[PDB]
Structure formats: structure tokens, C-alpha cells
């Protein structure tokens, strides 16, 4: 569809210096919209957009920035969300609804899943166009669960996944191969003691890379 059709041109733009020309924002913003609708993704392009906004303040677009941040969150445990934050100055992070979105992201990063779903205005406008947003968040939660639990109450897992019906819960248990025993078996103890990072860490290389320009 549209994402695949724009992909080549955007990739070429990102390979050169035109990526620094704000005249190309109209094209990059439509690209972001397509990522949301088709549930496609391109971090490099999104960071380039944020960079263009930081360098050309008058072009700052609230909706596109919010979608970039929300999509970044759908990519946790990766460093996407943190990198985007590095590309938005304090003044803009403090503006509605960027402030609210960062707050929600904070709940996810700190793994307060119940609090996340509670604070999440389910009927939020920006979320409607972001296809698969809720399920993507669940994948991250299951990633964390697979690392931090050996066994877990069936009721608790459904709560953490956003208050799912038993039928919906079954979908996620099936996806990661979890099965009920007496509780849901997640991991053996000897396997659980292995240290596994919950979220990826940024470093000098990745950060200096985006800070270069």
C-alpha cells in the first residue's frame, strides 16, 4: 500500500542531505501517517522528522510528534522511545499532549502496567489511527512477564494486559506458549535466574549518532 510506495523515496531522502530540508516535511509527515494506519514503522525517518522540528521550530507538528512518540513506545523494549525524547527539547515535551504522552510512556518504562491502562484514555483521539497500538503494548508486557515471572495468576495477567476477557487472555497465552498448571506456567526457576534486561540501554554510539547533525 502507501507505506511500501513511499519507502524507496524516503530511504533515498535519508541517505543524503535533503533530510535536513524542512520542505520535505510534508512528504515525511504523510509517511508517518501511513506507518500509523498500516502499522508499519521507520525509526530513522521519524527521528529525522523530530530533528527537522527541533531545527525549524515553526514546523513543529503536534499530531505527528505524538504519533512518532506513541509508535516509538510500541517498539519497547528497544531504545526508540528514549531516542525520540533526546530529539525534543524541554519546552515542547511540556506541551499538551506531548507531556501526557511522555507520562504514559513513563508508566510503561517503569513497568507499572495496571497504572498505564488506568491512565490510558481508551477513547483518546490520537490512538484511533494508530493501528495495533494496544496489542503492541501487550507484546512488550508479555516480554517483561516472560522475564520477571516463573508462575503468574491468570487473573493478574489479564489485568496487566488491559483487563482482558478469558477468551482474549487465551490469545496471548497461546502466542507465547504459556499454559495453565494449577497458575500460568511462564518460566522455570533455573531459567528465570538468568539476568535479562527488561529494556534496551542507550549508549554513546547510538546517542552521538543522532546528535551528530
- State phi, psi for 71 to the nearest 5 degrees: -65, -35
CA distance 116 to 100: 12
- State phi, psi for 152 to the nearest 5 degrees: -150, 140
Q: What residues contact residue 69 under an 8 Å CB cut-off, 6+ apart?
A: 81, 84, 98, 101, 102, 105
Domain ranges of the chain: 1-120, 122-213
Technique used: X-ray
Helix (H) or strand (E) holding 117: helix 113-119
Find the length of the chain.
213
* Backbone conformation region of residue 163, classed left if phi is above 0, alpha if psi is from -120 to 50, else beta: left
Question: What is the side-by-side strand order in the sheet with 151-152?
Answer: 151-152, 184-185, 179-180
Q: What residues contact residue 153 under an 8 Å CB cut-off, 6+ apart?
A: 183, 184
CA 58 from chain center: how many Å? Answer: 26
First to last CA, the chain: 32
Q: What residues contact residue 76 under an 8 Å CB cut-off, 6+ apart?
A: 108, 109, 140, 143, 199
CATH 1.10.10.10 assigned to domain 122-213? The reply is: yes
Contact 116, 166 (CB under 8 A): no
In CATH, which superfamily holds the domain spanning 1-120?
ARM repeat; domain 1 (1.25.40.250)
- Beta partners for residue 151, in sequence order: 185
Contact 143, 77 (CB under 8 A): yes
CA distance 146 to 94: 34
Sign of the C-alpha dihedral computed for residues 16, 19, 24 and 28 taken in this order: positive
CA distance 9 to 173: 40
| Resolution value (Å, 1 decimal) | 2.1
CA distance 201 to 171: 30
Sign of the C-alpha dihedral computed for residues 148, 153, 154 and 156 taken in this order: negative
List the Cα angle 65/111/53 in 5-degree steps.
Answer: 15
CA distance 81 to 78: 8
Amino acid at each position: 500500500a502507501m507505506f511500501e510506495q513511499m519507502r524507496a523515496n524516503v530511504g533515498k531522502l535519508l541517505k543524503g542531505i535533503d533530510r535536513y530540508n524542512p520542505e520535505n516535511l510534508a512528504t515525511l509527515e504523510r509517511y508517518v501517517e501511513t506507518q500509523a494506519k498500516e502499522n508499519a514503522y521507520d525509526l530513522e525517518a521519524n527521528l529525522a522528522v523530530l530533528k527537522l522540528y527541533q531545527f525549524n521550530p515553526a514546523f513543529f507538528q503536534t499530531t505527528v510528534t505524538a504519533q512518532i512518540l506513541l509508535k516509538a513506545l510500541t517498539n519497547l523494549p528497544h531504545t526508540d522511545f528514549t531516542l525520540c525524547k533526546c530529539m525534543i527539547d524541554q519546552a515542547h515535551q511540556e506541551e499538551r499532549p506531548i507531556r501526557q504522552i511522555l507520562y504514559l510512556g513513563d508508566l510503561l518504562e517503569t513497568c507499572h502496567f495496571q497504572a498505564f491502562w488506568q491512565a490510558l484514555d481508551e477513547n483518546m483521539d490520537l490512538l484511533e489511527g494508530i493501528t495495533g497500538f494496544e496489542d503492541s503494548v501487550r507484546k512488550f508486557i508479555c516480554h517483561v512477564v516472560g522475564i520477571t515471572y516463573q508462575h503468574i495468576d491468570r487473573w493478574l495477567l489479564a489485568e496487566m494486559l488491559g483487563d482482558l476477557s478469558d477468551s482474549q487472555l487465551k490469545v496471548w497465552m497461546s502466542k507465547y506458549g504459556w499454559s495453565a498448571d494449577e497458575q500460568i506456567f511462564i518460566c522455570s526457576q533455573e531459567e528465570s535466574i538468568k539476568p535479562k534486561n527488561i529494556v534496551e540501554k542507550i549508549d554513546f554510539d547510538s546517542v552521538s549518532s543522532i546528535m551528530a547533525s
